[PDB]
A paper describes a structure:
Ferritins play a crucial role in iron homeostasis and detoxification in organisms from all kingdoms of life. They are composed of 24 α-helical subunits arranged around an interior cavity where an iron-containing mineral core can be reversibly stored. The ferroxidase center (FoC), an intrasubunit di-iron site, catalyzes the oxidation of two Fe2+ ions coupled to the two-electron reduction of either molecular oxygen or peroxide. Mitochondrial ferritins are atypical of those found in higher eukaryotes in that they are homopolymers in which all subunits contain both a ferroxidase center and a presumed but undefined core nucleation site.
Co-crystallization of FtMt with Fe2+ allowed the progress of the iron mineralization reaction to be studied by freezing crystals at defined time points following exposure to O2. Crystals frozen following soaking in O2-containing well solution for 2 min diffracted to a resolution of 1.48 Å. The main chain atoms of the model derived from these data overlaid those of the anaerobic structure above with RMSD of 0.13 Å (157 residues). The positions of the residues acting as ligands to the FoC were unchanged relative to the anaerobic structure. Metal ion occupancy at Fe1 of the FoC was somewhat higher, while that of Fe2 was decreased. While there was a small increase in the separation between Fe1 and Fe2 from 3.37 to 3.51 Å, this was not significant with respect to the estimated error in atomic coordinates. Strikingly, peroxide, the product of O2 reduction that is coupled to Fe2+ oxidation at the FoC19,32 was coordinated side on between the two metals (Fe–Fe μ-η2:η2 side-on coordination), Figure 3, in a similar fashion to that previously reported for crystals of FtMt aerobically exposed to ferrous ammonium sulfate for 3–5 min. Occupancy of Fe4 was decreased following 2 min exposure to O2, and sites Fe3A/3B remained occupied by Mg2+ ions. The only other peak in the Bijvoet-difference Fourier map corresponded to iron bound in the 4-fold channels.
Residue numbers in the entry:
A (entry chain A), B (entry chain A), C (entry chain A), D (entry chain A), E (entry chain A), F (entry chain A), ...: 10 to 177
The structure:
Amino acid sequence: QNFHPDSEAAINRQINLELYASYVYLSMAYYFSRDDVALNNFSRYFLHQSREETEHAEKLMRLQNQRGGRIRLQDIKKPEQDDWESGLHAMECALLLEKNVNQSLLELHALASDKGDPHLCDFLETYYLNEQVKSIKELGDHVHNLVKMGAPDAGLAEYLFDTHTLGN
Amino acid sequence: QNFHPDSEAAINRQINLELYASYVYLSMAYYFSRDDVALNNFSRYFLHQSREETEHAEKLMRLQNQRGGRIRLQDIKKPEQDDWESGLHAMECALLLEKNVNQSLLELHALASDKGDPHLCDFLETYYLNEQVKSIKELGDHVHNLVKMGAPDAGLAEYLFDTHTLGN
Amino acid sequence: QNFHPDSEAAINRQINLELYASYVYLSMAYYFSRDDVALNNFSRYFLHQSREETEHAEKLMRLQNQRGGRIRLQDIKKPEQDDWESGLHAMECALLLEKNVNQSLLELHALASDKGDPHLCDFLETYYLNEQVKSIKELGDHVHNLVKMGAPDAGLAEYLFDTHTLGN
Amino acid sequence: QNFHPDSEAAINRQINLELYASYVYLSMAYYFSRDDVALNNFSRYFLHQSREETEHAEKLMRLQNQRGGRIRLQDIKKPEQDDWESGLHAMECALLLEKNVNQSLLELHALASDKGDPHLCDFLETYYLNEQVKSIKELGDHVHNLVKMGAPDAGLAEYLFDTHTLGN
Amino acid sequence: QNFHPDSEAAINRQINLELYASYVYLSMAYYFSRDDVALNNFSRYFLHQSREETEHAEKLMRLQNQRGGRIRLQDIKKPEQDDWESGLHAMECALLLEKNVNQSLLELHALASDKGDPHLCDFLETYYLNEQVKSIKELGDHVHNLVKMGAPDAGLAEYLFDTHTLGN
Amino acid sequence: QNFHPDSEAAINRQINLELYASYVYLSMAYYFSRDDVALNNFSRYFLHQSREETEHAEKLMRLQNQRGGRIRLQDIKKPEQDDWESGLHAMECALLLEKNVNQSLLELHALASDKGDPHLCDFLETYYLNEQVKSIKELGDHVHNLVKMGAPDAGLAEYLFDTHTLGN
Amino acid sequence: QNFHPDSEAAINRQINLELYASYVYLSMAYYFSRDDVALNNFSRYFLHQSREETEHAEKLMRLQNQRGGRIRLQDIKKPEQDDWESGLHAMECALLLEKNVNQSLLELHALASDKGDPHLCDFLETYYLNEQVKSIKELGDHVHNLVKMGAPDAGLAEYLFDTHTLGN
Ligand SMILES: [Cl-]
Ligand SMILES: [Cl-]
Ligand SMILES: [Cl-]
Ligand SMILES: [Cl-]
Ligand SMILES: [Cl-]
Ligand SMILES: [Cl-]
Ligand SMILES: [Cl-]
Ligand SMILES: [Cl-]
Ligand SMILES: [Cl-]
Ligand SMILES: [Cl-]
Ligand SMILES: [Cl-]
Ligand SMILES: [Cl-]
Ligand SMILES: [Cl-]
Ligand SMILES: [Cl-]
Ligand SMILES: [Cl-]
Ligand SMILES: [Cl-]
Ligand SMILES: [Cl-]
Ligand SMILES: [Cl-]
Ligand SMILES: [Cl-]
Ligand SMILES: [Cl-]
Ligand SMILES: [Cl-]
Ligand SMILES: [Cl-]
Ligand SMILES: [Cl-]
Ligand SMILES: [Cl-]
Ligand SMILES: [Cl-]
Ligand SMILES: [Cl-]
Ligand SMILES: [Cl-]
Ligand SMILES: [Cl-]
Ligand SMILES: [Cl-]
Ligand SMILES: [Cl-]
Ligand SMILES: [Cl-]
Ligand SMILES: [Cl-]
Ligand SMILES: [Cl-]
Ligand SMILES: [Cl-]
Ligand SMILES: [Cl-]
Ligand SMILES: [Cl-]
Ligand SMILES: [Cl-]
Ligand SMILES: [Cl-]
Ligand SMILES: [Cl-]
Ligand SMILES: [Cl-]
Ligand SMILES: [Cl-]
Ligand SMILES: [Cl-]
Ligand SMILES: [Cl-]
Ligand SMILES: [Cl-]
Ligand SMILES: [Fe+3]
Ligand SMILES: [Fe+3]
Ligand SMILES: [Fe+3]
Ligand SMILES: [Fe+3]
Ligand SMILES: [Fe+3]
Ligand SMILES: [Fe+3]
Ligand SMILES: [Fe+3]
Ligand SMILES: [Fe+3]
Ligand SMILES: [Fe+3]
Ligand SMILES: [Fe+3]
Ligand SMILES: [Fe+3]
Ligand SMILES: [Fe+3]
Ligand SMILES: [Fe+3]
Ligand SMILES: [Fe+3]
Ligand SMILES: [Fe+3]
Ligand SMILES: [Fe+3]
Ligand SMILES: [Fe+3]
Ligand SMILES: [Fe+3]
Ligand SMILES: [Fe+3]
Ligand SMILES: [Fe+3]
Ligand SMILES: [Fe+3]
Ligand SMILES: [Fe+3]
Ligand SMILES: [Mg+2]
Ligand SMILES: [Mg+2]
Ligand SMILES: [Mg+2]
Ligand SMILES: [Mg+2]
Ligand SMILES: [Mg+2]
Ligand SMILES: [Mg+2]
Ligand SMILES: [Mg+2]
Ligand SMILES: [Mg+2]
Ligand SMILES: [Mg+2]
Ligand SMILES: [Mg+2]
Ligand SMILES: [Mg+2]
Ligand SMILES: [Mg+2]
Ligand SMILES: [Mg+2]
Ligand SMILES: [Mg+2]
Ligand SMILES: [Mg+2]
Ligand SMILES: [Mg+2]
Ligand SMILES: [Mg+2]
Ligand SMILES: [Mg+2]
Ligand SMILES: [Mg+2]
Ligand SMILES: [Mg+2]
Ligand SMILES: [Mg+2]
Ligand SMILES: [Mg+2]
Ligand SMILES: [Mg+2]
Ligand SMILES: [Mg+2]
Ligand SMILES: [Mg+2]
Ligand SMILES: [Mg+2]
Ligand SMILES: [Mg+2]
Ligand SMILES: [Mg+2]
Ligand SMILES: [Mg+2]
Ligand SMILES: [Mg+2]
Ligand SMILES: [Mg+2]
Ligand SMILES: [Mg+2]
Ligand SMILES: [Mg+2]
Ligand SMILES: [Mg+2]
Ligand SMILES: [Mg+2]
Ligand SMILES: [Mg+2]
Ligand SMILES: [Mg+2]
Ligand SMILES: [Mg+2]
Ligand SMILES: [Mg+2]
Ligand SMILES: [Mg+2]
Ligand SMILES: [Mg+2]
Ligand SMILES: [Mg+2]
Ligand SMILES: [Mg+2]
Ligand SMILES: [Mg+2]
Ligand SMILES: [Mg+2]
Ligand SMILES: [Mg+2]
Ligand SMILES: [Mg+2]
Ligand SMILES: [Mg+2]
Ligand SMILES: [Mg+2]
Ligand SMILES: [Mg+2]
Ligand SMILES: [Mg+2]
Ligand SMILES: [Mg+2]
Ligand SMILES: [Mg+2]
Ligand SMILES: [Mg+2]
Ligand SMILES: [Mg+2]
Ligand SMILES: [Mg+2]
Ligand SMILES: [Mg+2]
Ligand SMILES: [Mg+2]
Ligand SMILES: [Mg+2]
Ligand SMILES: [Mg+2]
Ligand SMILES: [Mg+2]
Ligand SMILES: [Mg+2]
């Protein structure tokens, strides 16, 4: 009922993108626990973000089932980098990733609106759009502090951010 | 991202209006604790409403920060009256104030819809539009009871409403 | 009784100044939670100061009611700046604000003394004058530490002050 | 030390006035428990006020002892009325009594100031002057509500005030 | 019913005498806390007796109300002395006072008997006559011990009685 | 702000006097624990007074810091006596010391009043002037009892005062 | 018994030196709470050291009493500086002070040994000599860390030491 095939396909594309974001964050988590990086709270922060993105994917899979769509999985592409360079660079990449995921969600909302699917619009507004705004704000805050503190070249900056902001 | 400058400005106008509503309610609270009014539960009721309106303003300020807008504060105008005349008159003025704030919020929602900003639309629907409906209903209930009871001329009406309805 | 009209008017002016100080601190709080400032404990510190200044205003409104004066509210002017530049600059501005509020309170005390109003003199001494001294001392301490640490140009100074002194 | 004989005598006069105020309130308490008045919460309210005035007298007696003065007691005059007429009239008389006690305390403060006795000035400001302001405000509130409600001629007014405001 | 006007008047006289006894004991309490007397347990003992005498007065006022009499208050005369000389002398004066109050109560009982008022007779027997006997016995015990111990001239006597008997 | 250099200097003189009073009481405490005096509760009483005087000094040092004055310490002179002769003599000396400290505080209050420094006036009234009155009263009480009991020549007097009044 | 007059005098000199050390530390404590120093944990650290030195003085006074010597107090000289310059300088001065107190205690031990006073030797070894060693070690540790960190010129050094080492 009232579930357009274009919407089914776009949900499937969004599932893949959430799974990709999970993998990017998993890659970052294990970069920060290398013996030549060793920022354990950066590692834990990105591991938590990876697990949140898996939940984002699962909620969309549940939506497909609830609405009678067919889940169609695709390969989860590897992250663009295996070496994330620094805590600052990884935060900047995460910020760009979250902005790109947000744009995809806003395009999905525009499609649902065009198709007169208020249930899908509300689902996105309730579980996705504000979550993306808060995540982009948080990552922007982190980038700003790391830049101001002198990261990555100032030797104390990433260490102190790891211990204070990401320690909690 | 997807935050229109017209929306930024309208949010700033709404912040000011919420702060104005706070000040109106603060003025009313301290009118009801005058030695020649002395309706302590009217006073407490309006003081609580004043504090709620401050929270309404703060949430919009947080939204501006989250979305990357610039908060631009303006003078908070004094309330139209320093003498609120009676418990009935203050309730009628509060009802008109809340209706005017509601109209401003509905205009802000219409602008956000025109600009294709579902995050802002959802923010208003989630935190503002139903809150305004419930507040207008509550104040309308209070006005009706005070009118029926004979306020302000019937000497027992405002006293009994203060002790029973606004006592809790 | 023994409440001079000059004192009534000066109390009304002081109410407005306390409300203005509240607004200044509210503005500062939301500056520090911008995505390009992101000093969350500076933000919380100034938000708490804003709420304290509202209480200062309310106590003076209660005094007006208790003494039989008429509260006369005025517009609450916007703060002089929307961009507070740095944690150091905001602290320096808060220090100057508190010194100006203190001077106004001392002028109010001098007027109450001239009018032979010991109740008003005692009210100011009990709730205002020592509070102002302690606040000026605290803000002076903060300015000194931020200056010594190298704020705002030394990239670690404001971050470390935020995490250690204003974290608690 | 620094205790002027004029101050000793004025303290003794104030002790007598506090004891007189106690007796007035005791008289009122037992008027309201007459079988042809029967307002038990008016009775309890004035009995509590009577006991507070005894404490006011005792604190001044302690001050005389602490400062090395000699307590000189005088007759406690009977109250002006044995029939207090109504709840409204008794409240109006209590308001006038408290205003007269306040004027006496302000005259005592002026004398202590003239004699350069800051300890006595502070004693009065700490324990007496604000207490008098709050008591005058409270009694003024009660008078206003009783007048508005139609007391003493409106048969429900004093009964309802007794049950609601003075019940607590 | 069965309440004779002579009984009403005699109750009013007894109320005044109980209030007078309260004042005598209050005077004694504050004599013992002078810096040149400084017997703090004598002070506390007489303060407690003062408060008991107020209760004796209030019970008679309640009786007047219960029986439909009219309370008619009179001035409360000051105590005969402001300087009570010694702990022994104050105890001897209290003993004489209680004997005089007892004689007045026995005269009141004789009047109630003559008027055939068993309720008043029982009231006096239940709340007053045995209380007076016990108080006279207690004060006689105290006088005897103070005399035997050498008061007031033996420098340790009043001090030791204060610390042991009146300490508790 | 509003802190006169004469006031700064007078506060520094008062700090020294409080420290001197501490030292006097320390000397007395250790006199009473000599093997040829052996009044352990006199010793504890004066040791407690010594520690209170240190707190009096510290509060004035904090005030100097809070107001932006410069603490200027001076030598703490030794007490006038190393042999305090008796419990009575030590109490009489403490009484004279507290009277002299009180006179200095009243002179400091007069200076603060002349300089229009209500914060300093209130500080002294709140923390010092009543504390001095109560201390002078307490020591006067102790002197009176010791004199009446026959101290120092009556062999039981100081022993019994030590065990009863200063035991607690 | 076995208490040499040279030992009595040397104990009296040591009492004075302990009291002097207390005063030095008190001065330092209130330097660190100036509005232009504002290192609150340096302040608390030195205040605690001041109170420990008072206890050191009191134990020697108790020893004099226990052994039958006569306590002879002398003026407590003011500290050499009122401006302690920096956290590093104050620590260096405290280290030198503790070394000088230690030398005095070792000279006192040598005298007690020469006089064949094993009780005094044991008293010093039990309560003083190891305490001095530990205090000198602790202050040396603090000096070393402050020097290495760049104090006083490196703007973060004293602030970070205050928050981490002296915070606890
Ligand atoms: Cl499912
Ligand atoms: Cl695929
Ligand atoms: Cl790469
Ligand atoms: Cl990089
Ligand atoms: Cl880059
Ligand atoms: Cl770094
Ligand atoms: Cl925010
Ligand atoms: Cl404006
Ligand atoms: Cl108007
Ligand atoms: Cl109206
Ligand atoms: Cl109308
Ligand atoms: Cl009404
Ligand atoms: Cl009702
Ligand atoms: Cl109010
Ligand atoms: Cl205006
Ligand atoms: Cl600006
Ligand atoms: Cl700046
Ligand atoms: Cl600047
Ligand atoms: Cl910085
Ligand atoms: Cl007393
Ligand atoms: Cl008289
Ligand atoms: Cl009358
Ligand atoms: Cl009437
Ligand atoms: Cl009338
Ligand atoms: Cl009525
Ligand atoms: Cl009810
Ligand atoms: Cl009754
Ligand atoms: Cl009379
Ligand atoms: Cl007499
Ligand atoms: Cl006698
Ligand atoms: Cl006699
Ligand atoms: Cl005696
Ligand atoms: Cl301080
Ligand atoms: Cl000196
Ligand atoms: Cl001497
Ligand atoms: Cl002597
Ligand atoms: Cl003498
Ligand atoms: Cl003795
Ligand atoms: Cl000892
Ligand atoms: Cl000397
Ligand atoms: Cl120097
Ligand atoms: Cl230095
Ligand atoms: Cl150096
Ligand atoms: Cl440093
Ligand atoms: Fe999470
Ligand atoms: Fe996601
Ligand atoms: Fe995400
Ligand atoms: Fe609420
Ligand atoms: Fe609102
Ligand atoms: Fe509203
Ligand atoms: Fe009711
Ligand atoms: Fe606070
Ligand atoms: Fe304020
Ligand atoms: Fe302030
Ligand atoms: Fe009360
Ligand atoms: Fe009173
Ligand atoms: Fe009163
Ligand atoms: Fe009793
Ligand atoms: Fe009695
Ligand atoms: Fe009696
Ligand atoms: Fe104490
Ligand atoms: Fe003192
Ligand atoms: Fe003292
Ligand atoms: Fe310790
Ligand atoms: Fe030491
Ligand atoms: Fe030491
Ligand atoms: Mg997929
Ligand atoms: Mg997250
Ligand atoms: Mg590939
Ligand atoms: Mg690739
Ligand atoms: Mg919608
Ligand atoms: Mg919704
Ligand atoms: Mg939501
Ligand atoms: Mg969401
Ligand atoms: Mg997220
Ligand atoms: Mg951050
Ligand atoms: Mg605004
Ligand atoms: Mg509400
Ligand atoms: Mg206008
Ligand atoms: Mg207007
Ligand atoms: Mg909702
Ligand atoms: Mg809502
Ligand atoms: Mg509402
Ligand atoms: Mg209603
Ligand atoms: Mg205003
Ligand atoms: Mg504050
Ligand atoms: Mg303007
Ligand atoms: Mg402006
Ligand atoms: Mg105070
Ligand atoms: Mg204050
Ligand atoms: Mg403050
Ligand atoms: Mg600080
Ligand atoms: Mg009197
Ligand atoms: Mg009361
Ligand atoms: Mg008369
Ligand atoms: Mg009369
Ligand atoms: Mg004053
Ligand atoms: Mg005061
Ligand atoms: Mg007060
Ligand atoms: Mg008061
Ligand atoms: Mg009162
Ligand atoms: Mg009322
Ligand atoms: Mg009477
Ligand atoms: Mg008794
Ligand atoms: Mg007479
Ligand atoms: Mg007489
Ligand atoms: Mg019986
Ligand atoms: Mg009985
Ligand atoms: Mg009795
Ligand atoms: Mg006995
Ligand atoms: Mg000094
Ligand atoms: Mg004391
Ligand atoms: Mg000398
Ligand atoms: Mg000397
Ligand atoms: Mg006080
Ligand atoms: Mg005091
Ligand atoms: Mg004291
Ligand atoms: Mg005593
Ligand atoms: Mg010495
Ligand atoms: Mg130590
Ligand atoms: Mg010198
Ligand atoms: Mg020197
Ligand atoms: Mg050995
Ligand atoms: Mg050993
Ligand atoms: Mg050992
Ligand atoms: Mg040791
Ligand atoms: Mg040590
Ligand atoms: Mg260390």
